[PDB]
Design a protein around this ligand. Structure first.
Ligand SMILES: Cc1cc2nc3c(=O)[nH]c(=O)nc-3n(C[C@H](O)[C@H](O)[C@H](O)COP(=O)(O)O)c2cc1C
Ligand SMILES: Cc1cc2nc3c(=O)[nH]c(=O)nc-3n(C[C@H](O)[C@H](O)[C@H](O)COP(=O)(O)O)c2cc1C
Lengths: 178, 178
């Protein structure tokens, strides 16, 4: 097993991929923006907290600080092209608010087509190196009935997986219960 | 699309699954322990920071605070049984240090069989609800050449995926580039 000591950023920082990308939706007055974030993770069950790590270079970063509210939606593999487009263009140069969406109970924009989504209230923001972790509290939950099993898990094969550098995939249908 | 307002912990907090579980290895003196963490994510590229969210209820939590160093390894789906076993028993009742492993350059224990692994130095710890986020700086990288692609990602369909509540899977071998 090859090894090397870190000497700065890694040549490729993708050893822990693939991951489901969370589409972050944010609205400031009339302006709506969306941006996928593969650096996301649950942070607490009670209370339910979910975090997304966003670079200060993204237009979304400033919008999140202004709105203090956002959505995190999870999309089927069938929307790979839309998700990639949203992650390859900036709100500084194109109105991504034209992507089909609706407003949640708290007013956050949710990209249409998701099998599930969270409406979040921003609790804290922490800087870790070149990205800021936005920690949100889940205040509302959206689910496309029939796409999640009895336990709330997205059915096998439906989720969009990101491998980094524009490469996507999906889970196999087969599962295992050790 | 159905919706409801959060009224405490969610009936199911798995909407963002599946995810690759990071096997966290830690050593304090002679004692070695391992515990999978599906709540993990990259946090920075420059410098390379990686985080794992661990409940204070885990035996691993105390060990991390003492050692201030740990490993995060990523395993092929073929090791689903071992990973699940490590995440279904506590170091309070069983010595998980007997699981085949080796020590990295910094002395952290790395579970054998991984296609890739990081040796990390604990930088910061932040409490978010019922879990603490351990932010580590990558100081060494391990890779199993024959199991990775050109960019350091697990080969097609090799990654172990966790859906939550003891259910696992793997990626389809098909990849797409929009
Ligand atoms: C699948 C995917 C996952 C991504 N993950 C992240 C991420 O976790 N954090 C981030 O800051 N950018 C990420 N990016 C990059 C942003 O989505 C991308 O820079 C986007 O164009 C930013 O849009 P904005 O400037 O309107 O905010 C990701 C891109 C893609 C396609
Ligand atoms: C696949 C998998 C992923 C898990 N993810 C996490 C996680 O992110 N955070 C956590 O605190 N526990 C997680 N658990 C639970 C711990 O791994 C489990 O409680 C383990 O027995 C703790 O061992 P310890 O007491 O020796 O630390 C996970 C378990 C499994 C099986």
């Amino acid at each position: 097993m090859r090894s090397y000591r870190a000497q700065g950023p890694l040549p490729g920082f993708y050893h822990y991929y693939p991951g489901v990308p969370a589409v972050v939706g944010v609205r400031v007055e009339e302006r709506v923006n969306f941006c996928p974030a593969v650096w996301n993770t649950g942070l607490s069950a009670d209370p339910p907290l979910f975090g997304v790590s966003i670079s200060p270079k993204r237009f979304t970063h400033g919008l999140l600080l202004k709105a203090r509210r956002f959505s995190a939606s999870f999309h089927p593999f069938g929307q790979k092209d839309l998700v990639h487009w949203l992650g390859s263009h900036s709100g500084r140069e194109v109105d991504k608010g034209q992507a089909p969406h609706f407003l949640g109970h708290t007013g956050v924009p949710i990209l249409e087509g998701a099998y599930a989504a969270y409406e979040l209230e921003l609790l804290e923001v922490h800087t870790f190196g070149d990205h800021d972790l936005f920690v949100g509290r889940v205040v509302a939950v959206w689910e496309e009935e029939g796409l999640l099993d009895e336990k709330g898990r997205p059915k096998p094969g439906l989720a969009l997986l990101y491998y980094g550098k524009g490469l996507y995939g999906r889970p196999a249908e087969e599962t295992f219960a050790p």
